[PDB]
Motif scaffolding. Sequence first.
Motif, short mmCIF file in Angstrom:
data_model
loop_
_atom_site.label_atom_id
_atom_site.label_comp_id
_atom_site.label_asym_id
_atom_site.label_seq_id
_atom_site.Cartn_x
_atom_site.Cartn_y
_atom_site.Cartn_z
N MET B 19 -16.70 -0.64 1.48
CA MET B 19 -18.13 0.17 2.53
C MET B 19 -17.58 1.02 1.46
SD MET B 19 -16.42 -1.39 5.38
CE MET B 19 -16.07 -3.76 5.67
N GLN B 53 -17.69 -17.00 0.08
CA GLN B 53 -18.93 -16.79 -0.28
C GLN B 53 -20.13 -17.38 -0.27
OE1 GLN B 53 -18.27 -12.47 2.11
NE2 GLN B 53 -17.86 -14.27 4.25
N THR B 54 -20.63 -17.87 -0.30
CA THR B 54 -21.89 -17.97 -0.33
C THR B 54 -22.95 -16.43 -0.17
OG1 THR B 54 -23.60 -18.53 1.69
CG2 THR B 54 -22.35 -19.80 0.84
N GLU B 57 -23.76 -15.76 3.06
CA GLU B 57 -23.31 -15.11 3.97
C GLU B 57 -22.88 -14.03 3.06
OE1 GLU B 57 -19.87 -17.74 2.71
OE2 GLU B 57 -20.63 -19.20 4.10
N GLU B 60 -25.64 -10.75 4.33
CA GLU B 60 -25.98 -11.03 6.14
C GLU B 60 -24.79 -9.88 5.87
OE1 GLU B 60 -24.98 -14.75 8.69
OE2 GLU B 60 -25.73 -13.10 10.09
N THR B 61 -23.58 -9.78 5.77
CA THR B 61 -21.98 -9.02 6.14
C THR B 61 -23.21 -7.44 5.62
OG1 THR B 61 -21.07 -11.08 5.28
CG2 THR B 61 -20.16 -7.93 5.83
N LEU B 62 -23.66 -7.39 4.00
CA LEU B 62 -24.46 -5.98 4.03
C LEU B 62 -25.20 -5.49 4.66
CD1 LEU B 62 -24.98 -7.03 1.04
CD2 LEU B 62 -23.54 -5.47 1.64
N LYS B 63 -25.88 -6.35 6.14
CA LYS B 63 -27.30 -6.12 6.82
C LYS B 63 -26.54 -4.61 7.69
CE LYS B 63 -28.52 -8.85 9.90
NZ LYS B 63 -27.56 -9.81 9.87
N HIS B 64 -25.33 -5.55 8.27
CA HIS B 64 -24.45 -4.78 8.95
C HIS B 64 -24.05 -3.09 8.60
CE1 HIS B 64 -24.61 -8.32 10.54
NE2 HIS B 64 -24.59 -8.22 11.83
N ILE B 65 -24.16 -3.14 7.09
CA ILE B 65 -23.43 -1.50 6.79
C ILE B 65 -24.27 -0.38 6.80
CG2 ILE B 65 -22.58 -0.53 5.15
CD1 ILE B 65 -20.67 -3.14 6.33
N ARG B 66 -23.90 0.98 7.90
CA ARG B 66 -24.98 1.42 7.64
C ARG B 66 -25.95 2.07 6.74
NH1 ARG B 66 -24.29 4.98 12.34
NH2 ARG B 66 -21.27 4.56 12.32
N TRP B 67 -25.37 2.25 5.44
CA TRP B 67 -25.45 2.86 4.46
C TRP B 67 -26.29 2.23 3.63
CZ3 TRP B 67 -23.19 6.81 6.25
CH2 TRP B 67 -21.99 6.70 6.98
N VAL B 68 -26.35 0.83 4.01
CA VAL B 68 -27.57 -0.19 2.94
C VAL B 68 -28.87 0.20 3.45
CG1 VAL B 68 -27.87 -2.24 2.33
CG2 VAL B 68 -25.28 -1.72 2.66
#
Lengths: 130, 130
Positions: B19, B53-54, B57, B60-68
């Motif tokens: 992050m 992680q696939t 997976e 899907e985690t990346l999309k939660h990070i505000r910088w992305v």
Amino acid sequence: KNVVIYADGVYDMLHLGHMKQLEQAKKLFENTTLIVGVTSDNETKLFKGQVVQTLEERTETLKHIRWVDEIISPCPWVVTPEFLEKYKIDYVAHDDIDIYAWLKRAGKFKATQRTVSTTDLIVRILKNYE
Amino acid sequence: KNVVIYADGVYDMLHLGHMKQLEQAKKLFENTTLIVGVTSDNETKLFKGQVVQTLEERTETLKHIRWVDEIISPCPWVVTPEFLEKYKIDYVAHDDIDIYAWLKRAGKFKATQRTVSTTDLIVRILKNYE
């Protein structure tokens, strides 16, 4: 039209579970300000059990999540009407499981669910060996 | 005035390390669009080693990070000029360590650093026992 949502938690070793839950509160309404409350270390230690990350660590991770607009760190352990007015909070967001009856009573309780944990992952690492 | 930044990676078992690095690329300039590229599973498996992680997976985690701002998932393993024009990418963001010389040559390479890993945490869990 902007609604203030408060969602408190420990947010220890955050993972997609926590993120999917924060996304849920954020999108409760069209226009939100999601305020997250991070529980103090000694209050967690005492009321829940071990906490793995310090307040600063758990709070620093939260700030990276796009759904999070504001952090109250540390936050008080039990929410109160005072606390609600002070932050002009409109709704409290948490999972069901009743120490939150008085919020439901006031139409101010909105419920969020869970899902995908760190622990799950070490298993997948160790599954590679008998 | 909006600059397109591309930062690729595996982003396996994301953590504050990743992050803080994504924040860094995002704030390279005043106005950015941060495009992240997530490497395919078999390409990681083959060129780096195990991936835990696939793709779905890790993405899907990346999309939660505000910088992305945008995800290219999967992304190609080595960046090319074609790829750059196709996405109208202005800069590539990565850590130093030279398979990225040709980008430095073109003023198109901006370097980001690391720091705080999952593995670190299990130690703190197991430290509680001899």
